[PDB]
Structures are given as C-alpha cells and as structure tokens.
Amino acid sequence: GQVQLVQSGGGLVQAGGSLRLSCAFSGRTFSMYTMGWFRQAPGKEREFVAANRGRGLSPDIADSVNGRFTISRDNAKNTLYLQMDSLKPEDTAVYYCAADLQYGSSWPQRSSAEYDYWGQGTTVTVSS
C-alpha cells in the first residue's frame, strides 16, 4: 500500500472571508494516520497549523489560528478539511496537508520531518 494525498481549494480572497481546503486520501485505513496541515509563507519556514488523529479525539491547533481555523475529517469520503474563517493577510501562504502513520510516532505531532506523506500544496492569498 501507498498513500496519495490530493489537495483542492485555494484562491485569492479578501480579508475577513472564509475558505475551506480539502485533502483527499487514497490508500488503506485512513484511520491509522494522523492528518495535519502545514503552511509556508514567502520567505519563512514550514509552520504547523493543525492536526487530527481520529473522529472522537480533540484536534491540535496552532496558537496563531486558534478560534479561526477548524480541522475535521470525513470518514465517508476519506477527506481532510481545513475551514479557514476570519482570514487575515498574515494567513497568506502555501498550505500542505500531510499524513503520519500513528504506529511508531506520537501525538501531538507538530514536527514536519516526522510526517510521511505530503500533498502537492495549495496557494491561499488574502488581500485587504
């Protein structure tokens, strides 16, 4: 078995608006993966945003987006979402989803070097 993550969504959006990003999972046993979102703004390093390890467990959300961004997974469609509300220009970045096999890893998991599969990235720009 392989894992493949396919991202959809993204665009140019005005501050205070709202977007939802999608990350489709392809492979076996969605539920054995921690799923996460990372972002990389121009110039800076990859930054942790949010992660989810399964339906009935609390997410791990970065301080910078707590109260604005929410993460959820759809088990029916094997899809990870990132709902971005109250967008700010500082949210401008390329957004990546990633998967971490839970066996042999740990929770919470904010280190990008510990994730094992990555989506292709989604560009989100927030204008004033």
Residue numbers in the entry: 1 to 128
What sentences appear in the manuscript?
In this work, we describe the expression, purification, crystallization and structural analysis of the variable fragment of an antibody BCD090-M2, which demonstrated an affinity to the extracellular domain of ErbB3 in preliminary experiments. In conclusion, here were present expression and purification, functional and structural analysis of a new single-domain llama antibody against human ErbB3. The phage display selection of antibodies from immunized llamas and subsequent sequencing allowed the identification of several anti-ErbB3 single-chain antibodies. The surface plasmon resonance experiment confirmed that the recombinant VHH antibody was functional and efficiently bound to the immobilized receptor.
The protein was successfully crystallized in two different forms: in space group C2 with a single copy of BCD090-M2 in the asymmetric unit and in P1 with two molecules and two cadmium ions in the unit cell. α RMSD for CDR H3 between two structures was 0.61 (chain A) and 0.57 Å (chain B). We crystallized the antibody in two different forms and solved high-resolution structures, giving an insight to the organization of the putative ErbB3 binding paratope.
